[PDB]
Amino acid sequence: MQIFVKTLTGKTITLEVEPSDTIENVKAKIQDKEGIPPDEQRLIFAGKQLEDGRTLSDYNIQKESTLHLVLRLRGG
Ligand SMILES: [K+]
Ligand SMILES: [Mg+2]
Ligand code: NA
Ligand code: NA
Ligand code: NA
Ligand code: NA
Ligand code: NA
Ligand code: NA
Ligand code: NA
Ligand code: NA
Ligand code: NA
Ligand code: NA
């Protein structure tokens, strides 16, 4: 199924996902498209920060849901 991820600057990222995917799998898909390491990604649905080990099903994230991506870089 398709979900959408909106970036801070308002670009859309379309993903193909399954309800059974973990948030970590979603971040891996975002890394495939945008090159962002997962540790530096935060995903938000309906105001909730999504935990990497939980599933899309855990959050009732259905087809055509929009998630918001926020980046938090490592210190260096
Ligand atoms: K939507
Ligand atoms: Mg750093
Ligand atoms: Na779609
Ligand atoms: Na499921
Ligand atoms: Na990846
Ligand atoms: Na990819
Ligand atoms: Na809620
Ligand atoms: Na977790
Ligand atoms: Na995980
Ligand atoms: Na779970
Ligand atoms: Na659809
Ligand atoms: Na739609």
Side-chain angles (χ1 to χ4, degrees):
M1 64 179 192
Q2 295 203 312
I3 64 169
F4 305 110
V5 180
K6 299 303 296 305
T7 76
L8 182 67
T9 60
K11 309 281 192 76
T12 302
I13 302 167
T14 301
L15 301 181
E16 182 62 30
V17 300
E18 296 294 335
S20 54
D21 280 326
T22 56
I23 300 309
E24 182 78 14
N25 288 353
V26 172
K27 289 181 176 173
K29 290 166 189 285
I30 290 170
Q31 184 181 22
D32 289 344
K33 295 192 176 215
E34 312 296 285
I36 311 304
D39 70 302
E40 293 174 311
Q41 304 175 34
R42 303 290 181 285
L43 290 169
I44 303 306
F45 178 56
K48 287 207 192 187
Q49 199 187 99
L50 310 182
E51 289 190 281
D52 281 351
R54 304 198 74 226
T55 60
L56 295 181
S57 281
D58 285 334
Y59 291 115
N60 190 35
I61 294 169
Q62 303 296 335
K63 65 177 181 172
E64 320 279 79
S65 292
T66 299
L67 285 45
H68 293 263
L69 176 65
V70 172
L71 302 189
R72 294 205 39 95
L73 302 184
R74 305 165 189 140

